[PDB]
Design a protein around this ligand. Structure first.
Ligand code: 2PJ
Ligand code: ZN
Length: 955
């Protein structure tokens, strides 16, 4: 009672939110939000310290970040460093943390029973941390792994490069991540004891007055109140003033500047940026959001629509962008066609024409009202969140908003402020602009290099004559304000649960044309529904050409519908449409109210679609580059790709796809579409706020619309063929090797094929994966430091399964091979030793994870959709498999390992894909390994092997 400075009033929440909330401020300055949820499976807490990278000392880049790794390694009360991770591990929890420019955010979840035990261990790091010196070298090699990861990633490159072109004296120029150089090599050379500087930064910065704590649990508001007072009232208050960065990092000499940048992927982008004051304080009227909505609009009369008609760009992003406390940015970013790259000046002229139009028209209240209405709807009917993300998010926002507004924060707009809009719009002018062009056409034409990532670039002043041209922009008649959004939902009725409602989806239609699975939502009760459709056609993947045409068809369909569908997206109604190895996939999600109207427009357009030649050529070129850009993908990404190609009956390569792409002409595509839609089978899942009858009426409308416009007829059952997995021979080991030409890291996937999926085989494999899961990370990543990516787990495809390992390392593939096999023996011993008690803990951990309950509709739909697309239809799977899992013995697992997985197992089926680093040449004891058969030709490999059956569906 005396340890609490004040209690907040009522925490404004949605009427639909049954969780209970209480805000308060501790006497030591800590802001608190408590969340009482008696139904939650997992409890969670989070602490956000309003200090991060921008506050690093200039001579030690990455220190805030480093302190984040170092802070959770042993305290006075809990000496052992593994304690926090261990306790969470033992009680179905997890933890994680992040460091930004102004924040360091620590969070965990745990089983609802063990909140106090977890929060106790958590609270100590903010009372008496030890920072065990033993780990220092490991945590530095960790931070170094992260940076090295991002080095070849174009987005991180652009992020840091922008920083390098501003005022070098401004904290905004800092390198926030750090690496081995900034945390070991340089501070050694300069005679810096990192540890005492770490400790110093902590002492100066980790003040309760800059801390926010969030706790979500089953316990009451009063019990949580007591617990948080008990644990956090002792955090020391050092009255640290909150860092402000009110000088803008781009000053007059950083303006009217042009940057020409070389990317890693063949991408072509234009970035237009305007320095603006910090708008955070105007949050109740949010004038940048207003301008972002309009400048970034995609409906008719939009900036984008005109840039698209002109053939200059495909996509556009607009609006306000965070900086830090004191400074912000307004951006207009576009991608560029080949013609766009030659008309950058004209593109920018058009941007200023639209900006000028918003001036001449002045502010519109009806637009603001629309935004207000949509945000109110969005807040009211917001999906429930996983507790871990929820607490972490709130902890951050506690630093920006009054207690009572912490949930409504990002949602609610109140007052229309025309003056403010006009103020922001006044900064959007040629004299305040910064321009960046990203293009490979600048390769070898650049004089500068960014130190952290190696990025190559050029800088030049924009000529005055250009600025003046932009300043003098006429009004353009192609630009118009949007009209009223007719997709705004108004019917939020939750339909009564039907008498014959089912717990799982039921087959409510089974015809030549369609299989329809349906479940009325009996859990979330929001006015939404998810409508998923799989369209099956043999002509979508028959050869590389057809697969190309499938892709382009749907890309052009989406491009054509975009103006119309954008309004619906703004109104919380969205769709996904993509091609598959079997046909097409369509998903429509969100508010059910106008859902049938959007669906019908899509099905109609699919069938009566008229192609724009100009768009066809542009989209085709963009797709070519997309196929090429896979070369720039990560090595482990490549490894996984190669293995799918290897193990699946039919699969066209990126090389085959691009080779066929030149044969896609407009007349060939126009012929393809009616052919594709001539014969179909549809399998659908309709899940949400809908009745059995409504479901049937939706399916009927989809069928009738295709039948009418495309003359669709059903496929033959014998035509509904799924692809099989390659059956590897007993005691075989095959290796496929390739090189990544971009990254100087290796990638590898090792796949131990087991058998066809079945209740028993599934649980043998999953328990084994459960057992080795933590050890694999601890040994291969933590101890041996093999690389950033270390993964093990079950692999499932085409009714078949096995065990896999994926690793990205500096070390050569064959080396990684011996270490994995070495690890596999370690676990062999380890299972023999392990106590019956420790074994049963593994079973319990697996069970809990498997029975994890979806917290939103989509997460429930996805589980159902999984069963539908695998054609196993096992909706009660979890319960059944857990029940079985519980009957398994330690022997069972030993037997299984010995028959299928052990180096000398009689039924070992091993396939490895090795992807070599850009430069690369073509401890527990590791066992002796046989000579692998090396795959030269994927077709030959496949021809020489049998193909598995397909799994019998659960009926
Ligand atoms: C958004 C991320 C990727 C984090 O990057 C940035 O914050 N800034 C880099 C920024 C792109 C950008 C712009 N102007 C520059 C001027 C000079 C030098 C580099 C620049 C980079 C960017 C903006 C954006 F909205 C989306 C992607 C982006 F890469
Ligand atoms: Zn890190």
């Amino acid at each position: 009672n005396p340890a609490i400075k004040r209690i907040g009033n009522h925490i404004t929440k949605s009427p639909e939110d049954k969780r209970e909330y209480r805000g308060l401020e501790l006497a030591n300055g800590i802001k608190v939000l408590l969340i009482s949820d008696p139904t939650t499976d997992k409890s969670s807490a989070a602490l956000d310290v309003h200090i991060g990278s921008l506050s690093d000392p200039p001579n030690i880049a990455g220190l805030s970040h480093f302190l984040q790794h170092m802070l959770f390694l042993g305290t006075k009360k809990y000496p052992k460093e593994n304690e926090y991770s261990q306790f969470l591990s033992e009680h179905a929890g997890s933890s994680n943390a992040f460091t930004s420019g102004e924040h360091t955010n620590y969070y965990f979840d745990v089983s609802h029973e063990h909140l106090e035990g977890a929060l106790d261990r958590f609270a100590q790091f903010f009372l008496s941390p030890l920072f065990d010196e033993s780990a220092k070298d490991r945590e530095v090699n960790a931070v170094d792994s992260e940076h090295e990861k991002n080095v070849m990633n174009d987005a991180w490159r652009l992020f840091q490069l922008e920083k390098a072109t501003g005022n070098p004296k401004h904290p905004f120029s800092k390198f926030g991540t750090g690496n081995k150089y900034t945390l070991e090599t340089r501070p050694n050379q300069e005679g810096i004891d990192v540890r005492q500087e770490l400790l110093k930064f902590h002492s100066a910065y980790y003040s309760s007055n800059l801390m926010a704590v969030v706790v979500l649990g089953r316990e009451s508001l009063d019990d949580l109140t007591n617990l948080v007072v008990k644990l956090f009232s002792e955090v020391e208050n050092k009255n640290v003033p909150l860092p402000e960065f009110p000088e803008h990092p781009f000053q007059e000499e950083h303006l009217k500047q042009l940057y020409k940048i070389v990317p890693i992927k063949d991408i072509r982008n234009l970035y237009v940026t305007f320095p603006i004051p910090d708008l955070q304080k105007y949050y109740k009227s949010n004038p940048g959001h207003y301008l972002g909505h309009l400048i970034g609009h995609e409906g008719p009369g939009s900036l984008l629509s005109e840039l698209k008609s002109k053939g200059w760009v495909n996509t556009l992003v607009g609006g306000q962008k965070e900086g830090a406390r004191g400074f912000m940015f307004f951006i207009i970013n576009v991608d560029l066609t080949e013609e766009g790259l030659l008309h950058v000046e004209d593109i920018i002229l058009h941007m200023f024409q639209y900006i000028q139009k918003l001036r001449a028209e002045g502010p519109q209240e009806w637009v603001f009202q629309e935004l207000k209405d949509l945000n109110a709807v969005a807040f009211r009917f917001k999906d429930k969140e996983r507790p871990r993300g929820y607490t972490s998010k709130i902890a951050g926002i506690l630093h920006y908003y009054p207690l009572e507004e912490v949930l409504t924060a990002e949602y609610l707009l109140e007052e229309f402020r025309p003056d403010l809009i006009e103020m922001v719009l006044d900064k959007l002018r040629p004299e305040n602009v910064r321009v960046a062009i990203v293009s490979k056409s600048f390769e070898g034409k650049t004089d500068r290099t960014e130190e952290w990532y190696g990025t190559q670039y050029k800088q030049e002043a924009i000529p005055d004559e250009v600025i003046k041209k932009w300043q003098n922009a006429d009004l353009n008649g192609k630009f118009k304000l949007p009209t009223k959004n007719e997709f705004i939902p108004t019917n939020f009725e939750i339909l009564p649960l039907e008498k014959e409602a089912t717990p799982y989806p039921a087959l409510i239609k089974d015809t030549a044309m369609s299989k329809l699975w349906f479940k009325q939502d009996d859990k979330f009760f929001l006015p939404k529904a998810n409508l998923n459709f799989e369209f099956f056609s043999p002509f979508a993947y028959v050869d590389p050409l057809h697969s190309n045409m499938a892709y382009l068809y749907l890309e052009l369909l989406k491009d054509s519908l975009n103006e119309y569908a954008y309004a619906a997206e703004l109104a919380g109604l969205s769709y996904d449409l993509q091609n598959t190895i079997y046909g097409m996939y369509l998903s429509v999600k969100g508010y059910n109210d106008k859902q049938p109207i959007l669906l019908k427009k899509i099905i109609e357009k699919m069938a009566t679609f008229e192609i724009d030649e100009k768009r066809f050529e542009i989209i085709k070129e963009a797709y070519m580059r997309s196929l090429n850009n896979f070369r720039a993908e990560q090595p482990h990404q490549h490894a996984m790709y190669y293995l799918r190609l290897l193990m699946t009956e039919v699969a066209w390569t990126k090389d085959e796809l691009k080779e066929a792409l030149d044969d896609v002409t407009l007349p060939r595509l126009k012929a393809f579409i009616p052919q594709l839609l001539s014969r179909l089978h549809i399998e659908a899942l309709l899940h949400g706020n809908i009745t059995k009858q409504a479901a049937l009426g939706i399916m009927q409308m989809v069928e009738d619309t295709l039948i009418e416009h495309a003359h669709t007829k059903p496929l033959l059952p014998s035509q509904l063929v799924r692809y099989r997995e390659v059956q590897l021979p007993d005691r075989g080991w095959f290796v496929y090797q390739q090189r990544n030409e971009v990254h100087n890291n290796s990638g590898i996937e090792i796949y131990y094929q087991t058998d066809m999926q079945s209740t028993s085989e599934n649980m043998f494999l999953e328990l084994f994966a459960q057992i080795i899961s933590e050890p694999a990370f601890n040994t291969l990543r933590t101890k041996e430091q093999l690389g950033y990516i270390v993964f093990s787990g079950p692999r499932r495809a085409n009714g078949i399964q096995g065990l896999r390992f994926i690793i990205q390392s500096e070390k050569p593939p064959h080396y990684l091979e011996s270490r994995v096999e070495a690890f596999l023996i370690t676990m062999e011993k380890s299972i023999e030793d392990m106590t019956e008690e420790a074994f049963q803990k593994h079973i319990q951990a697996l069970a809990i994870r498997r029975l994890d309950k979806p917290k939103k509709l989509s997460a429930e739909s996805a589980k159902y959709w999984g069963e539908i697309i695998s054609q196993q239809y096992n909706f009660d799977r979890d319960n059944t498999e857990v029940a079985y899992l519980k009957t398994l013995t330690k022997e069972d697992i030993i037997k299984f390992y010995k028959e299928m997985l052990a180096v000398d197992a009689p039924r070992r089926h091993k396939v490895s894909v090795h992807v070599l680093a850009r430069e690369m040449d073509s401890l527990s004891q590791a066992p002796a390994l046989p000579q692998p058969e090396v795959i030269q030709n994927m077709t030959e490999f496949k021809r020489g092997l049998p193909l598995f059956p397909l799994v019998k569906p659960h009926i």
